[PDB]
Amino acid sequence: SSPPVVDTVHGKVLGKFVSLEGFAQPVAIFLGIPFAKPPLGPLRFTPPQPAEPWSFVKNATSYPPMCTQDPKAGQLLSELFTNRKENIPLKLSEDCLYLNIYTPADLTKKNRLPVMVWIHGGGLMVGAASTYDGLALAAHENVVVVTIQYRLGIWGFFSTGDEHSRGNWGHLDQVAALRWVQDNIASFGGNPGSVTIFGEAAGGESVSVLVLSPLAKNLFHRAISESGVALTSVLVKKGDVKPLAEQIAITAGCKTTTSAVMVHCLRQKTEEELLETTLKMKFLSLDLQGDPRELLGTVIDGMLLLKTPEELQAERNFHTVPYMVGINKQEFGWLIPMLMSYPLSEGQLDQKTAMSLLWKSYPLVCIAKELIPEATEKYLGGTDDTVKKKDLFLDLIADVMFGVPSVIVARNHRDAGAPTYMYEFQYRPSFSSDMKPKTVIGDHGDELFSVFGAPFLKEGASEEEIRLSKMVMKFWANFARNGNPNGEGLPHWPEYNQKEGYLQIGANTQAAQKLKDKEVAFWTNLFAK
Ligand SMILES: *[C@@H]1O[C@H](CO)[C@@H](O)[C@H](O)[C@H]1NC(C)=O
């Protein structure tokens, strides 16, 4: 009747009710709650500060701006990934440190429901919380769903490699949002003692990063990485970040005399100017010319990450929470290459062209030139059919970006004594772009529709697709509840232990063993030549 009003640490918020078919209790939704001070002016390239408190009742019933980003690419990704019947257009702003809350709890009664905090993907460059409607997951599984934003691109990841601009601002924003959830979620019927972080692609990489960061201690109790981990190398910069910083500075019209001079100049630029610079840098496509070894992202900054992910894994001081790590069958099948304008159009590929392409693909796969013939031969050499070569080439890219890093992370996590689970998702959603070939199954992002209940929001899902979403949401929420996805009515999902059991999720969901085992061996041996 009366819209719901909730006390938070910094003031009161007003949300709205939305009913979902099948559920008598409306879900209370609060959109655009700030969890930090807007990072404007001198606060650019600094850690997020607490939000300033507000008087009276803040109206939390409209979607916030998305963090500044290429609007064309951001809109396109939102349209492709949204679980909503209609994509919600968003404004851009630097003032973007907001989260959205979907709580199925009757807030007039006592509730301490599991909380699931969603970290969106988009390469650390694009993306928005508001793409993901929490309504269906929250109602079907009785969990509080929180979708967060974090600074993107230059704003989120500009690093001088030193104390004048350490980097990882967007990850610090993710931490700040988690701190806010600890301090406030009980007011929305959530249990701050049961917080599950989950995310896809760059969001899954962020989750994996958080598992490795001391700054995230006591902020979550389970984790889920979907199609991205901290060994997804395209997102993690090792070695010297100064040349990139200088390139950004120069492109923005700034001198490079010192790091502090660069950062000061960049802090005087307008949002418009930094977006112009962003677009000039071409951050989500491959460089046409010159050395492939010459992207923005996560760095080893000394505050969030003290050493490389590989070193932190070997040390097992990371957070040994229950962790679910998964991939999709064909991660490089359609969506990623299409969004990147990846330079492969023909539908066939000879081996010479494959080798040159894999070198030009260095930013994505990080494969040294001397290793390229041996890698290309492994995947493509067994067949003289150039169509088949092309499909195997897409498998090559997927395995290096996603499957191999995911299994290495899951193995290290298990070996530290943490409960670990894996999956491979193999289904082609009806919600796919009708420009995607009918034969691409388990593309990057295809699991999103199941996790977020798209069959309950969008039109056209088959009986099988409806049931697949129910099953997936239930596994995810059981994992949030118990650190173990299993429950009555659901296929058995083995623990990822020394037998390396994992779940093959799709139309016929069943357990299997030793996901990507032969691929991990191949690549690990190759990279150690
Ligand atoms: C809250 O915001 C909506 C627009 O998003 C507006 O229509 C509504 O009247 C507002 N309610 C207030 C300020 O009480």
Residue numbers in the entry: 21 to 314, 318 to 552
Show sentences the authors wrote.
Carboxylesterases are a family of enzymes that act on a variety of both exogenous (e.g. cocaine, heroin) and endogenous (e.g. acyl-CoA esters) substrates. They are defined by their ability to hydrolyze ester, amide, or thioester bonds to their corresponding alcohol, amine or thiol and free acid in a diverse range of chemically distinct compounds. Carboxylesterases comprise three distinct domains; a central domain containing the catalytic triad (S221, H467 and E354), a regulatory domain (RD) and an α/β domain. The active site occupies a 10-15Å deep hydrophobic pocket at the interface of the three domains with all three catalytic residues arranged such that a proton transfer chain can be established.
